[PDB]
Structure formats: C-alpha cells, structure tokens
C-alpha cells in the first residue's frame, strides 16, 4: 500500500491473506465475508497471460494476522480451500471486467477480537455511499512503492483512505474500457494528497463505514492500476455490489 500507515490492532478483522503452498509465497489479499467464505479478485487465481491457473490445493489463506513478520499463535489462523469459484463471465481477455472470485474454506473459521467478517452492501448503501468524493478504506501487505529496490515489503498491515473518483475522470485516466462492474478511486494531481493499492494488494477489500448503522461494508475489491500511486492515474476496484447476485448463486447453492 502506497502512502499507507501501519494499522491498529484489530482494525480490519476481515482482512484475509492469500498465500501459495509451494513456494510459501504471498499471492494476494482477500476479505472474510462469512464464517467459511472468502472474497478475492479473479486475476489473483486465473490470469492466463502470466500462466496463472490456480486450483484449491495450490494455495492457502491466513486470517487475523497483524505483523506479517513474527507469527502470532492462537489469534491468527491458516486455512485450506475446499473449492474456488471464479465468475463465469470474468473477462480477463480485455480489461478484467467482472474481476471477482470466491473461495470456500475446507473447515469454517471461528471469530475472535481479530477475525471478524465484513458486511456486504445492499442497494441502498451502495447507491448512497459509492459516490465521487466520499472516501473508502483499502488494506493490504503490498509493495510500499511501485518499484522496490534494496531496502518495500511491510511488517504490519498497511491501510489508506482514498476518495472515490467520477466515472468520466476514471475512464479518461486510462485506456481500458471501464464497465459498470468497476469503479476507480484515488486523489488528484491538484489535490496535494497521494495513496494507492499496489503489488500484492490485489483482491483485498475496499470498505466504507455506513453512516446509517456504523457498520463497515465492502464496496470494492482491489482490481488493477497503471503502476502504483501515479499522477493522472487511479486505482480501479471491482464494484462489489453489481456482482452480488453471483455471490448469492454460489453461496446459496454450495453452502
């Protein structure tokens, strides 16, 4: 996370971390939505142009971690995937349209002071909150800068509060055809403020606190961007609500 600060303890209890089995390498971020369902971005699991075609047995997840370095027994947990469900109409070919994927844990997880599920939006919360100007939260353990060097990989969770950008400014920043299933966020050149999700932050949760019930909802999923924290460019996130239909059809048929 670029321009992010270290998180407080238990500040994002839904934050899930996608690791590969062999090698033990961090692939992506993700979010906890139920006691056994995890939400990530589809390209984190399937992206052919880079030979990415993961199965259940290829990777694992870690939950409740604060300090990426020292392992914390009891509070954190590791989990195996029973199945992976990628949106059938996820269009990696053109633009990562419908960039989303769900993962079912082999055994459900128990909630604590540090493992707690994020909420998913309704029509009203999504239509009220996802508006240009309002600020949402992004979390991850990604590269602190676009290009790492010798001294880049954070010790604890990193977090930014990034404002939403109008659809026209978004689709003017980049050459990619942005769809109704994605929105973009970030500051602006003449706004004197920076921040962006970066490498390894993909698939993580973009969240906002609802002024109607003081609850945290996941409005987006860290999808893509031109580098990291670039002037005139913005971070693009999967409009979590639009595809929530799909999120039902799987969880309410493979529950």
């Amino acid at each position: 996370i670029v321009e992010g600060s270290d998180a407080e303890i238990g500040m994002s209890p839904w934050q899930v971390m996608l690791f590969r089995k062999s090698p033990q390498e961090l692939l992506c971020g993700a979010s906890l939505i139920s006691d056994r369902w995890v939400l990530t971005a589809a390209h984190c699991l399937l992206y052919p142009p880079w030979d990415k075609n993961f199965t259940e047995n290829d990777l694992l997840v870690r939950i409740g971690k604060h300090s990426r370095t020292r392992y914390e027994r009891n509070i954190e947990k590791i989990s195996m995937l029973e199945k992976i469900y990628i949106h059938p109409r996820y269009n990696w070919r053109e633009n990562l349209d419908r960039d989303i994927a769900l993962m079912k844990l082999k055994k459900p997880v128990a909630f604590s002071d540090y493992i707690h599920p994020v909420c998913l939006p309704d029509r009203e919360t999504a239509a009220s909150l996802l508006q240009a100007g309002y600020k949402g939260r992004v979390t991850g353990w990604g590269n602190l800068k676009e290009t790492w060097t010798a001294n880049g990989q954070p010790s604890v969770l990193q977090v930014v509060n990034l404002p939403i950008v109008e659809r026209p400014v978004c689709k003017d920043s980049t050459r990619i055809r942005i769809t109704d299933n994605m929105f973009c966020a970030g500051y602006k050149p003449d706004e004197g403020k920076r921040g962006d999700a970066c490498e390894g932050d993909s698939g993580g949760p973009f969240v906002m606190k609802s002024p109607f019930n003081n609850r945290w909802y996941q409005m987006g999923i860290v999808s893509w961007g031109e580098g990291c924290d670039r002037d005139g460019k913005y971070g693009f996130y999967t409009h979590v609500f639009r595809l929530k239909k799909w999120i039902q059809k799987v969880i309410d048929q493979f529950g």
Partner: peptide
Amino acid sequence: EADCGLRPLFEKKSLEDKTERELLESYIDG
C-alpha cells in the same frame, strides 16, 4: 453473521480507529 462490520476492538468496544473520522467527514464536506 449478523455482527458484520462491527469490529470487536472498536465498534463493539465503542472506539474509533485513528482515521475513520476521515471517512465520516467525507460525507459532509471535508
């Protein structure tokens, strides 16, 4: 499942994180 969004060490213990006032204040103006 019905306690979503409510963090145990914040919203449930009646505490704010160091930056959520930004998100709340972005709803008015500043």
